[model samples]
Target: ATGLHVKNGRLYEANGQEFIIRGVSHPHNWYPQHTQAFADIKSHGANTVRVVLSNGVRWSKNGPSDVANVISLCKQNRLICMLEVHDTTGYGEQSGASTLDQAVDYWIELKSVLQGEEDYVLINIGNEPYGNDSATVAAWATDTSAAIQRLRAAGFEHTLVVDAPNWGQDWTNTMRNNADQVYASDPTGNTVFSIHMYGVYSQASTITSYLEHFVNAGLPLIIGEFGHDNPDEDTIMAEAERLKLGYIGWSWSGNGGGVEYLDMVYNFDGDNLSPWGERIFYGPNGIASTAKEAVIFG
Candidate 1:
């Protein structure tokens, strides 16, 4: 139930065991509407489930109370939950105020509700803080780190996940160059770096290069977000396995448009998996999306 920490680029448990997380990112409270989705996730072999809190969703109104029901559901299903606070609807650009004070205010409220729930949850500061630049991004990270420090100081030892600049794509610029300075300013540990990958938008080779930069730097990394066509999906999962890094596939949906690519997993009849959905959900090999099957099962 304790948080998993990242020290020197490797994820370590409180007892000092290294671990890799394999999971999925789904819409908030999706479990209630899609009960079979949870079953499918378990069947597909995912150990963790990342849930997003949209800027003005239920949680925004009354904290984790909005998600209490869903959290309880995950508990019954035996899945680890990563609570992601996504403030912006668009992919790029910062919303709300441009200052760290405003961002801290937002996170503090959310933390109040989530602080003691470390057994089943991890706190993700924001979906992506680098829609602007390094300075703004650093400010975002620093402020969020301070929030985590406050939580820990108050006896909340939950695992806090901090995202990199440029929507978690520019880890080299943030960690390799400025992580020391940032951590020094705010001396909190047990933090993991989060990064997202969309191989079609960015080349696999380029992402591999950046990932290597973090791994060599001795930091724990997570493929917090990623999606791809079949070929690229294989390449991405293969590389994640080779590196022993944790990852979560994009989503399970049948929605149209840009997000359509992520809506591959669906249960049309509620309890039964749709035939069209099964092909994309299971991949061509008829296996779960992740390369390692055991992580999801265990």
Candidate 2:
């Protein structure tokens, strides 16, 4: 019965000890061969890893077998797996992006591999479910709640992670304003909200204010994805640490599409940490200095 639970807007392990996610994201769908990345991440003091996957709705799908292998790698490395569907990123704005409903179906289809892994895996329904246009984006809460319901209906008992709209930047505070409602939508109340801090979060004031909103409201939040170019990475990490919120960097390596700078390592080799990687893993308030392994791994 080992699993993660939420109470009073904080994440706790099956043993009731607090579990803060200090980790990095990995683009598993594109670079499936980097199986060694998992262990390498743990070696650097990371306790969690958000893996990128596809549902066959956009890019190639990571079938049940591959997903199982991914989870195994995470467990072998003693890292909590935060698996997400990359295809659902930027649904309305990004061409060829998959919808949250499609992502839900993908998870249900792979339920065999995901079930009973609550202690090791977190189901992030979709990545950046909605794009810009916050005013016209009234469906974010509705669709997100529906996705949560669909997963619950399918008997998924694992803690669910939901990303915000506006490409996950949530510059307009849409996710912040409606986080409570979406959280309430979860019958189990085990859902965690994620915000991608990118260029939109370039100011310390913005970062502190946004994070404080959730903390003051007694809502769960995490810096799901932040990058070097965000210009305020330090603030994000510092504030997260100060507020006791969890955060996962953009990626470990294999970054492409001119975003190679986001890569944490070169060729997935943990020894060769990029400048960006050094800052997140070894710098002040970084993973190396703060990450604590989940008791489930013990």
Candidate 3:
């Protein structure tokens, strides 16, 4: 197993040490057909993957066996997996959103499979657990803190990744101003903040400021999801590399609705690279130029 911990605001592999996660998000729950996504992402020099999953709420349930298989696939591809609950995509303000409470119960049920898997799997409690309603920030902080406490109480020592409120955009500085409080609540002090860069982060100044706000204070942070569209994607990579932060682009494939443009490769095929994919994985300071494999794999 890879020994992992945080020191001076960055994640490290005790042997390799200080590995910034350069990767993409894979919607396994949606496109189960893309079993090759992990290897595809890895071949492109990605060292990490933020995988999307559901717990019998909004989508088909990813049961204990399914969770275990995903972890195995990650290890096979030599990738670090950050599994998030998609059911919590917008708990507070979105219609029919699953509560983090439910998400917690789901994890508790899967605890039998997750224990002792720290080196490979990071438990992202939920995906954008809160919505656009500003009032929920307080609850977001409190509930998230409570969720971390629950996981630790159940013996989950893996670093817990928590997404920002307001659909992960953190438009009102809620996650920013109140981050320390949430971090303080994690008795393990192993929580990392994840911010989604969208229209809210259009300016380079805003991008740097928000990320700097976390690193300058020694709280771990990551660009959990973004695209080459809004939020000034180029600046996102430049600052991440300069600041030595972590990032994972929106997706590997099967992107739909108004966001098909976020897909990295076409049809989950590595041979085909979308324009967004080309820039994210090959542009200056991008994954191809910045990613490194975890020592555990070596």
Candidate 4:
């Protein structure tokens, strides 16, 4: 009854109005110095921001108080916040990647500060929690379901976002096939499925097919992450807009590991937008044209 909720395959605000997320990802845990990135992203007309954090498995863990500051910044900017634990990205293949259980533990520890912020925040359980493998895919459903149940058992009422396995691309269709079972695990029925589109989603048909699976099935879904260089970025947006689904671009700034091209802006400066930033923020069907702030901010 509080915060964002999913009903009939759509995301609605606390006021019961549909809120489609159009925003960019911010690596807050790595670049903690860029607290102003929140306002900067808002300047570009984004209604939401998918922030990355760590649980001390791969990077310095952002403490509960640090998460409180992140929530504060989002509220100050009047932006919806989607907080994700980065430590769980690629659990099986990536070195230092933490388990979904670890990510759940991290959230449980932050319950103090997260208690009343449900209206402004969506707890993204983990980012890309599995690698590309059939065995991993098999575990994706069970582990994801367990994560949702654990959160509910711990008394978190916020709409939870669970990322697809296979590094969130889900080429194996694991999430697509088992999403119903996973959704049913959440007694609150407030869980949203997330998909990350990358090179694996080069074809428009591929993108639409994957997205359509969720929509036609009456499931809440979102493009949690998409790369600028991905050939299907345009299609991802077009289809997202056409389908009334949410889409958050790969990043706002501070992209590293040779993927700096994904940076939306330079040094967290909204005015200094990268080509990807311009395309996503101002291009056709972009955030400027589609994003709507949550009415709860009023």
The digit string of per-residue lDDT tens for model 4 on 1-298 reads 3788988889888788999999999999989898888998898899999999999999999998899999999999999999999998887888778999999999999998988888899999999999875776689989999988998899899999999989999888888999999999999889999999998999989998988888999989999999965557888899999999999998998888999999988887879988999999999999998888889988
- lDDT of each prediction vs. the true structure? 0.59, 0.90, 0.87, 0.90
Query: Model 4 reaches what TM-score against the true structure?
Result: 0.98
Q: Using TM-score as the measure, which candidate wins? A: 4
lDDT of 1 by residue, 1-298 (tens): 3555556667654556665677777665333366556556656666677776544432353255666665665666667777766663223364452233333455566655666566567767566655545456656545656655665665556776766666665643654466554455434456777777753334667667766766786666787877765325655666777787887766655444656646645532323454433543465532355434322224
Cα-based TM-score, every candidate: 0.76, 0.97, 0.97, 0.98
> Where's the lowest-lDDT run of ten residues in candidate 3?
1-10
**Selected candidate, larger TM-score, 1 vs 3:** 3
Residue-level lDDT tens digits of model 2 in 104-155: 9999999899999999999999999888855435688999999999999999
The true-structure Cα RMSD of candidate 4 reads: 1.0
TM-score ranking, high to low: 4, 2, 3, 1
Model 4's number of clashes is: 0
- Clashes by residue pair, model 3: none
2 or 3, greater by lDDT = 2
Poorly placed runs, candidate 4 (over 4 Å):
none
Which prediction has more favorable TM-score, 1 or 4? 4
Q: Give the lDDT of residue 62 in candidate 2.
A: 96
